[PDB]
Design a protein around this nucleic acid. Sequence first.
DNA 1: AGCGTGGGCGT
DNA 2: TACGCCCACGC
Length: 84
Amino acid sequence: RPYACPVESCDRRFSRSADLTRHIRIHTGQKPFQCRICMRNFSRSDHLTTHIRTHTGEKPFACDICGRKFARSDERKRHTKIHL
DNA sequence: AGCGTGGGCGT
DNA sequence: TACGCCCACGC
Ligand SMILES: [Zn+2]
Ligand SMILES: [Zn+2]
Ligand SMILES: [Zn+2]
């Protein structure tokens, strides 16, 4: 990790410089992606993609056991474990 | 449950 | 750079 955050209060370090460039948005407060629906801003395009599903009700991820649908794969993952 | 949001990293 | 997921933490 040759790339450290130059911010005074922060001690984080990164392997790839591009990851620090993304991280630095936490301190500058830049949120480049906007929701056309509710006008809310987001720091990441991937998080913007999933936020919009809270409006459309789109749920691409169904549980392998019962078939209950989820907007994000991680919610389905958190759910599947309840069948154990 | 509903879902924000950072870290690791692949395309 | 710009984007897209997995994985995880958090409220
Ligand atoms: Zn920092
Ligand atoms: Zn929105
Ligand atoms: Zn299920």
